[PDB]
Design a protein around this ligand. Structure first.
Ligand code: LMN
Lengths: 601, 577, 257, 86, 367, 75
C-alpha cells in the first residue's frame, strides 16, 4: 500500500539556464553535472536531513486573515543543488528570470545565501563555492556580476541548526549600487579586447593591478561586461560557480530574500506663477511659469513614479476680439488666439547608460567635446506655437432679409500649429500644421419645383509638415538624414436637397479629397527646401471622390379614386466612390522594365 | 471552425484564429484558390471529399460500417517539433497591439528602436568591423532608421513610394496592419532573422541557417532563435531581444475624452492643455456620470496638443488603506491678497510586512506656500476705450497667483527590514506553483508499459495477442471515503481504521507548520494505491499466473495532463509526499 | 452647544430580511454518502435606508446605507456641525469629508472618510483634516479627442500560435510578393477555406454553423512542390523524395503536386 | 385586530430539450444532449401593516438526467421575507 | 509579531456584530442596556427601558469588492416583568451564493452553495436585587463553510455552549458637579464541548470560551446630556498552544502538541490561567482591553469613540472606532467605522457597520 | 455570460468566454481584499494561480463596459 499524501507536478518561475556561462567549457550539454533547482519551505522542509530549513535571522512570516483567523504565510527559499560529477574549476550553473526592475531610488541590494554539502558526498569546503547574481539586459553581453565566496554550514551532527549559523552574515550579499556605478565609469575606459578582461569579457576591478581599491567591497567581487542598466533590469540570474582548482565541488545553496534597501528620499521643489488678466472684454492674457526640481511629485507617486527631471516650462495664451475693433453696425466675429510656450527638461540620469547621474557623468569625463555632447543630448526641449482665427463670420443684421449671395452665410476658420523639439532621440524635430476651412450653408424659405430647399458647401485646406532628424548619440558630428512627412490636402464637400413635389424629396451630396504633391521631384524624392505656404491655394490631383443621392417618393396614387387605400413609399439611396490607387500601382514597373498603369478603384 | 472563428488573407495565403493554439491542438485545412483562370486545391472539402460513412448490409447483425477520413493539410501538429517544416508554417512576424481594436491611420504611431541599454532608433556596427560596403538603397543599415531597416517605411502619407520614406510606419490595412484586430504584420516573415542577416551579409560564405558562419555583426543583431525555436526556448538567447516596437494609438470610440472612470467625484477633474490648467466652465465640460471630458475651446480642438486629464476614481479594488491628513492656512492680508500654508501627509498601510516590487507603499509629505492677489485695473479699460471702435464699460482685471511646494517622500515604517526601507525583488514565496495529480477519479487503467526502451519486451508490451496483458497484477487506486471515519459503516471496526494504511491523515501531522482557517478541511485526502502482485489483474488471461514470480508483474494507472507544454510552463519536477 | 432641542432626523427607504432553508441534492455517484444532500440556512439582508435630518439647528445629518451597490462611493454618511459665525470653530465635518485646495502643485482630496475641522482667527482660516482616502489618482493623455495608449513590445513578443501560413509555397512567396508593397507580386486569390481543429468541447449544436464532425487525417507534405531557393528537407518531412514530386520546381501548391 | 388580503402566485414550468444525431444508412440514432427541468415557485404576500409585510417563498426545481454527463439536481429554497418600509 | 496565538473553533463568535458596540471599541459588557446586549451581557436585558425590542445589524466584508459576504445579526428581547427578560439572538456569517460548475454548457443546471456559520442563542435574565441581575444563555453553533466535492464531506459541524452573565447598575448618585451612575458587568461565555469539523473524536477544536469583565461611569449634565466612559477586559479561557518546547528535535514539539490537544474544555478553562513559562507579568499579556466614551444628547443623538487593544503577541488587533446613533420616534439607527492601528490588515477596515432597532411595548421606569 | 471552470479547484482553472473580443482584464482578490492576481491583455483560458493559499477568492472580469464579480474556491 502506497499512500500519496501529496502528488504534484511542480513548475517554477526561475528557469534553468542552459548554455555555457564560461568560455573554457563551450559544451554545456555534457560533463554529467546534475543541476537541480527547487524550493525549501518552513511548511514542508522543517525536518530536512543536512540542515533543517529556518528563516534568515530577522525574517518573519507574513500574517493574514483568512476567516477571523490569523494565518502565518509560508516562507520559501530557492534551492540550487549541484551533484553527480560536480562543477569544474571555472564552470557555473545558474537559474534566471525575466523582470522589469528599476533600482535607481535604492542604495543597497541585499540577499541571503546559504551553502551546505550534499549527503553521502565529499564535503564542500569554505570559499570553494561562490554564489553570484548576474543582472542586466542579458546574461552574456551586458550585465553586472556580484560574486561572494560561500562559507559552508557544518553538518554531521544534529539536523537542527540555529538560523544565525544556517544563514551566516559572511554569506549575505550587501551591495552598494554606487559601487556598480563606479565600476561602470571605470570600465568605460577599459577596452573590449583589453587584457584586463577575462576569457568571458567580464572586467573585474579586483583583478586589475593598475587600480587602487578594486571594486570597493572587501567581501563581494564585482564585474561588468557590456554597459548594463540597473535602472531597467530585464534579466536576473542567480547561480553558483566554483573556485577549487583541482576539485569538482558538489553541494546545495539556498537563496533568500533578494531585496532593495536604503531608499533615497530626498524631496523636490516646485514653483508655479500665473498671471491672468482681462481687458474690457477685448483682451485676455494668461501666462504660466512652472519650475520643478528632481524628486518632486504627487502624494500618491511611488519611488519610480516621481519626477526624475528638472522641468522649466512657460506658456502664454492671448485672446483678442478683433471684431470689436470694427464698428458694431456691421458686426464681425473675428476672434484671434495666440498661444506660445516651451519647456526644457534636464533628466536626473544621463539617457545614455540609463543608470549614471548626469552631473556625475559630466564631472568624470575629462573631455570637453564629450561633456558638450552629453549635456546637449540630455536636454529635452519642446516649443509650441498656435495662431487661431476660428469662427470668422458676419452676424445677421437685426432686420435683414436672408439672401443666397449674402456674406453672412460664410464662416472661416484658420489654424496654425508649430512644434519644435530636440531630445535624446531627435536632434531636430519640426511639426507644422495649417488648416484653412471655409463653410457655406444656406436654407431657402417659402414639371415640378426646381428650387433647392437648402444648399451646403464647405472647403478645407489641411497641410501637415513634419521634419524628423534623429541624432547620433555618440558624437554630434553628422547625425541622421532628415525625414520629411508632408500631408498637403484640399477637401471640399457640398450638398443640396430638392422638394420637387410634396411627395418627392431628392438629397444629393458630393465629397472630394485631393492631395497636393508640389513638394516632390520627378522621382520619388522629397524636396528639403520647401515652405508650407509655398502654393497654399493649389488644388491637387484628385485622391478620393464620393457621391450620395437619396430619393424619397410617397407615390401619390390616391389621386385616382380606385387605389385610394394604397400607401406606397419608395426610397432609393445610391452611392458612388472613386479611390485613387497608390503610385506603386499607377506606375508599377515589371522586372522587364515596362511600366503599367494598374488604375484606380 | 466557423467563419467567425478565423480570418484569412486571400492574397498572402495565411490565416489568423480567434483562439490561439498554445496546447497540443491539431490544425488542419483545406483550401482552394484561383490564379487567373487556374484553380488549385490543396485539401479535401466536405463537398468533394469521401462520404463520412458507408454501410453495407440490411440488418445490424451483418452490417459493415466504413467511416472515412478527409485528407487535409497539417498546419499545426499534435506534438511540437521545431525541426519540421510544419513549425515554419506558424507566423512569427505578427504582433498584437495590446487593447487595440480599431486602430486607424493618423491615430497609430509605430517605431522600431534598439535598447542597449537606451532606446536608439539606429544600429551601429560592432567595434572593429563595419556594415557591408556599397549597399543597395533598400538595404541601407549604417545611420538608417530601423523602420527602413526592417522594411516598414518606404511610402509617404498617401502610400506613395518615397526615396527614404517619410519616417512613419507604413499603414496598409491588407499588408502591414490588421485594422479589425489591431495587429501589425511585418513585410517579411523573419524581420529580425533572415532579413537583418541579409542586410548585414558581407559574402556568400555566411549562411543564415549556419550560425557558426556569422560575421560578428550577424552574431549580435540576428535573433534567429525566435524563429527556429519556441519563445520559451528563445528565452535562452538573452543578448538578442533588444529590438523594441514602441508606439501609441488613439482610442476615441465616441465624442469626448474617456477618462476611464464612472461616477467620479465632482471637482476632482483637472485638465492641463499645454502646462496651463483649464477652466471647468469655459475651456471644457465634464460629464461625471458617463466619465467624459469635452474640450470646449475651439483653439485646443484643432491643436493636436496633448491634453492631460487627472481625476480621482473611487472604484478602487485591492488597494492599500491610505491615510490622508494635514492642514491648510488661508490668511488674508487684505481684501485682495491671500496667503496659504498647506501641509499634507499621505501614508499607505501595506497588507503584509513585505512589499514586493510594484506593490509598494508610500509615506509621502508635501507642504507649500501660496499667494493670490486679484485686483481691478481701470487703466486697461481706459486704454481699451482709446481703441477705434471700442466703447465698453466692463471692468478689466488682473490676478497673480504664486505657489511653491516641497515634497518629502518616504516609506512606511511597517515595511522596513532591519530599519531600512525594503523592496523585495524576489522573496521566493511566489515561485514553485503546483498542479495536483492525486485526484483518484482522474486516473484510469494503464496500458502495458516499456521499462527500458521501445525494443524491451519485459511486460509483454510488444505483444499483439492476449499475452500483452499477461503481466498485469491487481492494483486499486482510491481515496478512503470519509464515511469510514465519520459515520462508521457496519462491519468496520476501530482496528480497521488504525493501520497506517487505512488511518485518516491530518494536516497537523504532514504539515505541522501550516495554518488552516477554522471550519476548513483539516485532513489530507491521500491517494492510496494498493498493489497485489500475486493477484490477477483485469483482462489478464495468463494460463499460469500463480506459478510465476509476483515481482515480474506490474500494476499501473495513467492520466491526461491539462497543460502539455512543460517547457513553456517550466514544469520542473514531480514532487510527492 | 446646540441651537435647540428639535431632532428631526428622519429615516426613509426600506429594510428586507430573508430567513429560510436551502436544500440541495445532486445525484453524483462519486460523492460520499455523507454528501447525499446539503441542508443549509439562508439569511439575507437588503438594507436600503436613507437618513436625513437636523439636530438642534446645528447638526445636519445625511446618510445613505444601501446593501445593493458598491460601498466604496454609495454608502454615504455626513455629520456637519456648524456653530454661530462669531465662534472660533466654523465647521466640523465627520464622515464623508472633502479637502478642496485652490492649488496646482498640491492637489486636494475629494473622497475621504474622517474628521474635518475649520477654525477662524479673525482673518486666518485653518482647515484641518484627518481621514482615510477612498480613491486613487488616475491620469490620461488625450490628443485630437480620444485618449492616447502607449505600447512597448519586444521582438520575441509576437502573436504566437495564432497565425499560420496555408502552405510552404505561400511562406516562401511572402517575402518576394511584398517586395514593392502595397503592390503584391502575386495573383493568388484564396476563394474557399475550411479549418478543422481538435474537438474537446464535444458539444453538438445546430446553431453553431451546423453539426459538421468528420474524421480527419492531416498530412504535413500534402500539396507541396519543390522551391527554387529552399532545399527539399525544409519543405517536406518525407524521408525519401525520389519519385515523390510530379510537378515543376515552382508550381503553386496543389493536390496534384 | 389584524386583517388583510393574502396574495398567492404559483409558477410551474416543465422544459424538455433533446438533441438527436441520425444516420441515414443505418439505425444509429445518437442522443447527443438533453435536459428535463421542472420548477415550481410559490409566493404568498401578507401585509401586517402599512409598513411591515411578509412574503412566504418556496422554490422547488428538479433537473433529471437525460445523458449520463449530467447529474439529477434538486434545489429547494423555502422561507420567509420580512420587509419594513419608511 | 504574533507569538503563539490561541487557536479556537468558530472564531466568528468573537466578532462584534452590532454598530453600537463596534463604535465603543468592541465592548458592551458594562455599557447601558440595549437591544444588542446579547453577545456582550444578557444580564442587562432585565434593565431594559423598553418592553420589547428587535434589531437587525449588518457588518459587510470586502465592501468594495462584493456584497453578500457579511455578518448579519437579528436580536429580539422581551422583558415580561420588572425583574426578568427573555432574549433570542441569531448571528449569521455568510459569503452569499457561490456557483459550482464543471462544464462550459450554457444550458447546465448548476449547484449553488452558501458556506456559512450561524449561532442561534436564547438567554434568560433575572434581576436578583434592585441593582443587580444574572443571566443564563444557551447557544447552538453550526459551521457549514466547506463545500461538498469528491473526497471532501461538507457535513456541518455543530456544538452547544452556555453563557453566565451578571450586570450591576447603581442608582443615580449626585456629586459636586454632576450626578453620575455606576455600572459593572461580567460574562463567561462559549462554555461547551469542543467542535469537531472533521466529525472525529481525535480532532477537535476548543470553543472560544471568553471572560469579559467591565465597568463604566456616566456623567449626567443638565439631566439631558450624558457622557459614559466604559472599560472592559477580555481574556480567552482556552489553553495557549506550546511554543518552542516544554518537555529528538521534532519529537518534543509533537509531544507538546499532543499534550495540549488532549485537554478537556472544563480543565482548559482553569488551565488558561498559567500553563506558560512566563509568570504573572507575562500572564497579563493574555488580557485585551477596550476603553470608550459615549456622549448622549436628548437621549436621541449618540456620538461614540472607542479604543481596542490586544496584545501584539496574539491577534494583534488594535484600533480606534467612531459611531453615531439616532432615534427618530421608536427606531434607532447606528453607524460605526474603524481606524486600524495594527500591522496586520484588519478585515473590517474601510467598513461602515449598520444597526437598526425597533422598540415597542410599554415603558419601564429606570431605578 | 461568464463561466468559471471547476469552482472548487486547486488553483488551476479556466474561463468560459463566449468567443467575443478576446482582450479582457481579469483580477483575482483574496478575502483580505489584497490584490493577488492581475491579468491584462488576457486571452488564454487557463489560469494558474495555484501558489495562492486555500480559501475563497473574488474574480473580477472586465470586458468593455461589462463588469462581473464571481466567487471561486481554492481547496
Ligand atoms: C419573535 C419576533 C416576531 C416579530 C415581531 C414583530 C412585531 C410586530 C408588532 C407591530 C408593532 C412593532 C413593530 C415591529 C416592526 C419590526 C419589523 C422588522 C422588519 C425586519 C426587516 C408596530 O407598531 C408600530 O409600527 C407602525 C407600523 O408602521 C404601527 O402603525 C400601525 O400598525 C398597526 C397597528 O398596530 C396597523 O394595522 C397599521 O395600519 C398602522 O400602520 C404603529 O402601531 C406603531 O408605531 C407594534 O407592536 C404592537 O403589535 C402587537 C402585535 O400583536 C405586539 O404584540 C406582541 O407580539 C409578540 C412580539 O413578537 C409578543 O410576544 C407579544 O407578547 C405581544 O403581544 C405588540 O408588540 C404591540 O406593541
Amino acid at each position: 500500500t502506497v499512500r500519496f499524501g501529496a502528488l504534484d507536478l511542480v513548475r517554477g518561475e526561475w528557469r534553468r539556464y542552459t548554455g555555457t556561462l564560461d568560455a573554457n567549457d563551450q559544451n554545456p550539454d555534457d560533463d554529467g553535472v546534475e543541476f537541480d533547482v527547487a524550493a525549501v519551505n518552513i511548511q514542508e522542509n522543517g525536518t530536512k536531513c543536512p540542515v533543517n530549513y529556518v528563516m534568515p535571522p530577522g525574517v518573519q512570516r507574513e500574517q493574514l486573515y483568512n476567516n477571523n483567523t490569523v494565518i502565518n504565510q509560508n516562507e520559501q527559499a530557492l534551492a540550487v543543488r549541484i551533484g553527480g560529477a560536480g562543477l569544474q574549476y571555472q564552470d557555473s550553473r545558474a537559474v534566471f528570470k525575466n523582470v522589469s526592475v528599476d533600482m535607481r531610488q535604492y542604495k543597497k541590494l541585499k540577499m541571503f545565501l546559504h551553502a551546505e554539502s550534499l549527503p553521502n558526498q565529499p564535503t564542500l569546503e569554505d570559499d570553494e563555492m561562490v554564489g553570484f547574481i548576474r543582472f542586466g539586459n542579458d546574461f552574456t553581453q551586458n550585465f553586472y556580476q556580484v560574486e561572494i565566496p560561500l562559507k559552508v554550514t557544518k553538518t554531521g551532527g544534529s539536523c537542527s541548526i540555529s538560523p544565525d549559523l544556517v544563514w551566516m552574515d559572511d554569506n549575505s550579499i550587501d551591495l552598494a549600487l554606487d559601487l556598480l556605478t563606479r565600476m561602470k565609469i571605470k570600465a568605460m575606459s577599459i577596452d573590449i579586447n583589453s587584457s584586463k578582461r577575462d576569457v568571458n569579457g567580464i572586467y573585474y576591478p579586483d583583478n586589475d593591478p593598475d587600480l587602487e581599491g578594486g571594486d570597493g567591497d572587501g567581501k563581494l567581487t564585482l564585474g561588468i561586461k557590456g554597459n548594463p542598466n540597473f535602472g531597467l533590469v530585464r534579466n536576473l540570474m542567480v547561480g553558483v560557480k566554483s573556485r577549487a582548482d583541482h576539485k569538482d565541488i558538489k553541494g546545495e545553496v539556498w537563496f533568500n530574500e533578494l531585496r532593495l534597501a536604503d531608499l533615497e528620499n530626498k524631496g523636490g521643489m516646485a514653483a508655479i506663477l500665473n498671471v491672468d488678466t482681462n481687458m474690457a472684454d477685448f483682451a485676455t492674457v494668461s501666462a504660466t511659469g512652472r519650475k520643478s526640481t528632481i524628486g518632486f511629485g504627487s502624494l500618491e507617486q511611488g519611488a519610480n513614479e516621481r519626477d526624475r527631471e528638472d522641468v522649466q516650462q512657460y506658456n502664454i495664451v492671448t485672446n483678442l476680439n478683433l471684431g470689436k475693433l470694427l464698428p458694431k453696425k456691421w458686426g464681425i466675429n473675428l476672434p484671434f488666439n495666440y498661444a506660445i510656450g516651451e519647456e526644457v527638461i534636464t533628466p536626473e540620469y544621463d539617457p545614455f547608460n540609463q543608470d549614471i547621474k548626469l552631473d556625475q557623468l559630466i564631472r568624470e569625463t575629462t573631455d570637453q567635446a564629450e561633456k558638450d555632447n552629453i549635456r546637449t543630448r540630455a536636454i529635452d526641449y519642446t516649443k509650441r506655437k498656435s495662431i487661431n482665427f476660428i469662427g470668422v463670420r458676419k452676424d445677421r443684421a437685426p432686420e435683414q432679409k436672408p439672401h443666397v449671395y449674402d456674406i453672412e452665410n460664410f464662416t472661416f476658420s484658420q489654424s496654425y500649429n508649430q512644434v519644435e523639439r530636440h531630445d535624446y532621440e531627435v536632434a531636430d524635430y519640426e511639426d507644422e500644421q495649417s488648416n484653412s476651412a471655409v463653410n457655406y450653408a444656406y436654407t431657402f424659405q417659402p414639371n415640378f419645383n426646381y428650387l433647392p430647399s437648402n444648399i451646403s458647401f464647405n472647403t478645407n485646406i489641411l497641410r501637415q509638415s513634419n521634419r524628423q532628424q534623429f541624432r547620433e548619440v555618440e558624437v554630434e558630428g553628422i547625425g541622421l538624414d532628415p525625414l520629411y512627412r508632408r500631408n498637403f490636402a484640399f477637401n471640399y464637400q457640398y450638398g443640396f436637397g430638392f422638394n420637387l413635389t410634396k411627395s418627392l424629396k431628392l438629397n444629393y451630396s458630393a465629397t472630394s479629397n485631393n492631395i497636393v504633391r508640389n513638394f516632390l521631384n520627378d522621382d520619388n524624392s522629397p524636396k528639403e527646401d520647401f515652405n508650407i505656404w509655398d502654393d497654399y491655394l493649389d488644388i491637387g490631383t484628385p485622391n478620393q471622390h464620393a457621391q450620395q443621392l437619396v430619393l424619397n417618393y410617397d407615390i401619390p396614387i390616391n389621386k385616382i379614386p380606385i387605389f385610394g387605400f394604397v400607401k406606397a413609399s419608395y426610397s432609393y439611396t445610391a452611392d458612388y466612390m472613386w479611390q485613387r490607387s497608390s503610385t506603386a500601382f499607377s506606375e508599377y514597373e515589371d522586372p522587364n522594365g515596362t511600366v503599367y498603369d494598374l488604375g484606380n478603384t | 471552425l466557423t467563419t467567425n472563428e478565423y480570418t484569412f488573407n486571400p492574397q498572402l495565403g495565411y490565416i489568423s484564429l480567434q483562439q490561439r493554439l498554445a496546447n497540443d491542438e491539431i490544425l488542419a485545412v483545406a483550401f482552394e484558390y484561383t490564379v487567373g483562370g487556374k484553380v488549385y486545391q490543396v485539401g479535401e472539402f466536405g463537398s468533394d471529399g469521401v462520404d463520412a460513412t458507408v454501410v453495407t448490409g440490411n440488418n445490424s447483425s451483418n452490417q459493415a460500417i466504413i467511416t472515412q477520413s478527409l485528407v487535409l493539410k497539417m498546419l499545426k501538429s499534435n506534438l511540437t517539433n521545431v525541426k519540421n517544416p510544419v513549425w515554419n508554417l506558424m507566423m512569427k512576424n505578427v504582433y498584437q497591439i495590446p487593447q487595440a481594436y480599431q486602430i486607424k491611420q493618423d491615430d497609430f504611431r509605430l517605431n522600431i528602436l534598439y535598447t542597449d541599454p537606451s532606446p536608439i532608433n539606429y544600429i551601429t556596427p560592432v567595434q572593429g568591423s563595419s556594415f557591408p560596403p556599397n549597399p543597395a538603397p533598400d538595404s541601407k543599415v549604417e545611420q538608417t532608421p530601423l523602420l527602413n531597416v526592417f522594411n516598414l517605411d518606404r511610402l509617404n502619407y498617401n502610400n506613395d513610394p518615397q526615396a527614404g520614406g517619410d519616417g512613419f510606419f507604413d499603414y496598409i490595412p491588407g499588408v502591414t496592419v490588421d485594422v479589425q484586430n489591431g495587429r501589425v504584420i511585418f513585410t517579411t516573415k523573419e524581420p529580425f532573422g533572415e532579413l537583418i542577416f541579409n542586410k548585414l551579409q558581407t559574402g556568400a560564405g555566411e549562411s543564415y541557417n549556419d550560425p557558426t558562419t556569422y560575421n560578428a555583426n550577424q552574431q549580435k543583431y540576428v535573433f534567429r532563435n525566435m524563429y527556429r525555436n519556441t519563445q520559451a526556448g528563445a528565452l535562452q538567447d538573452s543578448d538578442k531581444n533588444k529590438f523594441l516596437l514602441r508606439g501609441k494609438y488613439k482610442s476615441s470610440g465616441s465624442n469626448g475624452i474617456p477618462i476611464g472612470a464612472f461616477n467620479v467625484p465632482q471637482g476632482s477633474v483637472v485638465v492641463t492643455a499645454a502646462g496651463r490648467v483649464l477652466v471647468e466652465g469655459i475651456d471644457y465640460s465634464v460629464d461625471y456620470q458617463l466619465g467624459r471630458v469635452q474640450i470646449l475651446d475651439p483653439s485646443l480642438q484643432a491643436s493636436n496638443t496633448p491634453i492631460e486629464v487627472s481625476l480621482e476614481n473611487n472604484s478602487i479594488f485591492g488597494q492599500q488603506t491610505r491615510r490622508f491628513m494635514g492642514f491648510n492656512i488661508e490668511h488674508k492680508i487684505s481684501d485682495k491678497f491671500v496667503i496659504g500654508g498647506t501641509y499634507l501627509k499621505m501614508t499607505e498601510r501595506p497588507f503584509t510586512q513585505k512589499s514586493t516590487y510594484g506593490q509598494e507603499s508610500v509615506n509621502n509629505t508635501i507642504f507649500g506656500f501660496n499667494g493670490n492677489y486679484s485686483t481691478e485695473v481701470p487703466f486697461l479699460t481706459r486704454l481699451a476705450n482709446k481703441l477705434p471702435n471700442i466703447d465698453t464699460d466692463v471692468p478689466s482685471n488682473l490676478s497673480i497667483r504664486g505657489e511653491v511646494a516641497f515634497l518629502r517622500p518616504d516609506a512606511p515604517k511597517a515595511s522596513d527590514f532591519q530599519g531600512e526601507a525594503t523592496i523585495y525583488v524576489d522573496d521566493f514565496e511566489g515561485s514553485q506553483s503546483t498542479i495536483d495529480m492525486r485526484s483518484a477519479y482522474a486516473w484510469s487503467l494503464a496500458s502495458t508499459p516499456f521499462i527500458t526502451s521501445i525494443n524491451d519486451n519485459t511486460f509483454n508490451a510488444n505483444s499483439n495477442t492476449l499475452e500483452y496483458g499477461f503481466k498485469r497484477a491487481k492494483l486499486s487506486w482510491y481515496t478512503i471515503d470519509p464515511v469510514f471515519y465519520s459515520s462508521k459503516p457496519s462491519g468496520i471496526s476501530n482496528d480497521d481504521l488504525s493501520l497506517n494504511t487505512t488511518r485518516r491523515i491530518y494536516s497537523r501531522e504532514l504539515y505541522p507548520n501550516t495554518d488552516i482557517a477554522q471550519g476548513q478541511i483539516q485532513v489530507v485526502n491521500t491517494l492510496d494505491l494498493t498493489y497485489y502482485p500475486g493477484e490477477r489483474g483485469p483482462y489478464n488471461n495468463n494460463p499460469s499466473f500463480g506459478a510465476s514470480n509476483p515481482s515480474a508483474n506490474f500494476g499501473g494507472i495513467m492520466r491526461a495532463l491539462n497543460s502539455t507544454n512543460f517547457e513553456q510552463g517550466n514544469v520542473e519536477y514531480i514532487q510527492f509526499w | 452647544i446646540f441651537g435647540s432641542n428639535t431632532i428631526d432626523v428622519k429615516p426613509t427607504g426600506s429594510v428586507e430580511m430573508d430567513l429560510g432553508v436551502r436544500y440541495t441534492k445532486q445525484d453524483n455517484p462519486a460523492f460520499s454518502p455523507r454528501n447525499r444532500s446539503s441542508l443549509t440556512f439562508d439569511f439575507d439582508q437588503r438594507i436600503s435606508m436613507s437618513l436625513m435630518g437636523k439636530i438642534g439647528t446645528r447638526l445636519e445629518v445625511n446618510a445613505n446605507y444601501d446593501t445593493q451597490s458598491t460601498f466604496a462611493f454609495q454608502n454615504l454618511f455626513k455629520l456637519a456641525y456648524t456653530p454661530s459665525e462669531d465662534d472660533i470653530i466654523q465647521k466640523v465635518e465627520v464622515g464623508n469629508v472633502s479637502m478642496p485646495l485652490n492649488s496646482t502643485l498640491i492637489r486636494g482630496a475629494q473622497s475621504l472618510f474622517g474628521v474635518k475641522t475649520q477654525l477662524q482667527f479673525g482673518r486666518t482660516t485653518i482647515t484641518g483634516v484627518f481621514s482615510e482616502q477612498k480613491s486613487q489618482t488616475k491620469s490620461v493623455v488625450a490628443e485630437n479627442g480620444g485618449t492616447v495608449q502607449n505600447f512597448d513590445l519586444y521582438a520575441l513578443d509576437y502573436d504566437n500560435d495564432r497565425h499560420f501560413f496555408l502552405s510552404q509555397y505561400f511562406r516562401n512567396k511572402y517575402d518576394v510578393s511584398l517586395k514593392n508593397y502595397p503592390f503584391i507580386d502575386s495573383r493568388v486569390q484564396i476563394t474557399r477555406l475550411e479549418v478543422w481543429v481538435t474537438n474537446k468541447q464535444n458539444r453538438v449544436t445546430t446553431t453553431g454553423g451546423g453539426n459538421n464532425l468528420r474524421n480527419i487525417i492531416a498530412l504535413q507534405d500534402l500539396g507541396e512542390a519543390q522551391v527554387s531557393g529552399v532545399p527539399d528537407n525544409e519543405v517536406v518531412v518525407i524521408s525519401s523524395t525520389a519519385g515523390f514530386f510530379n510537378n515543376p520546381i515552382d508550381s503553386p501548391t496543389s493536390n496534384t503536386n | 385586530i389584524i386583517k388583510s388580503d393574502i396574495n398567492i402566485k404559483a409558477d410551474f414550468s416543465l422544459r424538455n430539450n433533446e438533441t438527436l444525431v441520425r444516420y441515414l444508412d443505418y439505425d444509429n440514432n445518437q442522443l447527443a444532449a438533453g435536459q428535463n427541468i421542472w420548477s415550481l415557485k410559490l409566493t404568498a404576500d401578507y401585509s401586517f401593516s402599512k409598513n411591515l409585510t411578509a412574503i412566504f417563498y418556496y422554490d422547488h426545481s428538479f433537473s433529471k438526467a437525460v445523458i449520463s454527463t449530467s447529474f439529477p439536481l434538486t434545489n429547494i429554497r423555502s422561507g420567509f421575507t420580512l420587509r419594513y418600509n419608511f | 509579531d504574533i507569538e503563539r496565538p490561541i487557536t479556537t473553533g468558530v472564531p466568528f463568535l468573537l466578532v462584534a456584530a452590532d454598530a453600537r458596540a463596534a463604535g465603543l471599541g468592541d465592548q458592551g459588557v458594562a455599557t447601558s442596556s440595549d437591544v444588542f446586549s446579547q453577545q456582550w451581557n444578557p444580564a442587562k436585558y432585565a434593565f431594559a427601558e423598553d418592553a420589547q425590542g428587535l434589531s437587525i445589524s449588518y457588518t459587510p466584508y470586502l465592501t468594495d469588492l462584493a456584497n453578500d459576504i457579511s455578518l448579519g445579526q437579528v436580536t429580539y428581547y422581551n422583558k415580561i416583568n420588572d425583574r426578568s427578560a427573555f432574549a433570542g439572538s441569531f448571528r449569521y456569517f455568510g459569503f452569499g451564493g457561490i456557483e459550482l460548475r464543471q462544464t462550459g454548457d450554457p444550458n447546465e443546471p448548476t449547484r449553488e452553495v452558501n458556506p456559512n456559520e450561524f449561532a442561534l442563542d436564547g438567554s434568560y435574565s433575572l434581576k436578583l436585587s434592585e441593582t443587580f441581575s444574572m443571566a443564563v444563555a444557551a447557544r447552538y453553533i453550526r459551521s457549514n463553510l466547506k463545500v461538498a466535492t469528491e473526497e471532501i464531506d461538507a457535513s456541518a459541524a455543530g456544538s452547544f455552549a452556555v453563557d453566565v452573565a451578571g450586570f450591576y447598575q447603581s442608582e443615580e448618585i449626585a456629586y459636586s458637579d454632576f450626578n453620575g451612575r455606576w455600572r459593572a458587568g461580567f460574562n463567561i461565555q462559549n462554555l461547551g464541548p469542543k467542535i469537531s469539523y472533521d466529525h472525529d473524536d481525535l480532532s477537535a477544536n476548543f470553543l472560544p470560551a471568553n471572560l469579559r469583565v467591565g465597568g463604566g461611569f456616566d456623567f449626567i449634565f443638565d439631566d439631558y446630556n450624558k457622557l459614559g466612559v466604559s472599560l472592559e477586559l477580555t481574556k480567552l479561557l482556552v489553553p495557549t498552544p506550546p511554543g518552542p518546547g516544554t518537555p529528538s528535535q521534532s519529537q518534543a514539539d509533537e509531544a507538546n502538541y499532543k499534550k495540549y490537544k488532549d485537554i478537556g474544555w472544563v480543565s482548559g478553562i482553569f488551565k488558561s490561567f498559567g500553563d506558560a513559562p512566563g509568570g504573572f507579568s507575562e500572564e497579563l499579556k493574555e488580557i485585551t482591553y477596550s476603553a470608550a466614551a459615549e456622549y448622549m444628547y436628548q437621549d436621541a443623538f449618540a456620538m461614540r469613540l472607542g479604543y481596542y487593544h490586544e496584545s501584539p503577541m496574539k491577534g494583534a488587533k488594535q484600533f480606534f472606532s467612531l459611531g453615531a446613533g439616532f432615534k427618530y420616534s421608536m427606531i434607532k439607527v447606528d453607524v460605526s467605522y474603524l481606524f486600524s492601528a495594527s500591522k496586520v490588515k484588519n478585515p473590517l477596515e474601510n467598513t461602515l457597520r449598520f444597526s437598526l432597532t425597533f422598540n415597542f411595548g410599554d415603558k419601564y421606569e429606570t431605578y | 455570460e461568464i463561466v468559471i471552470f471547476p469552482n472548487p479547484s486547486d488553483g488551476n482553472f479556466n474561463i468560459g468566454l463566449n468567443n467575443f473580443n478576446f482582450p479582457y482584464s481579469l483580477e483575482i482578490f483574496s478575502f483580505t481584499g489584497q490584490k493577488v492576481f492581475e491579468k491584462q491583455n488576457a486571452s488564454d483560458s487557463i489560469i494558474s494561480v495555484s501558489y495562492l493559499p486555500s480559501g475563497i477568492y473574488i474574480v473580477k472580469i472586465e470586458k468593455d463596459s461589462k463588469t462581473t464579480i464571481k466567487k471561486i474556491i481554492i481547496n
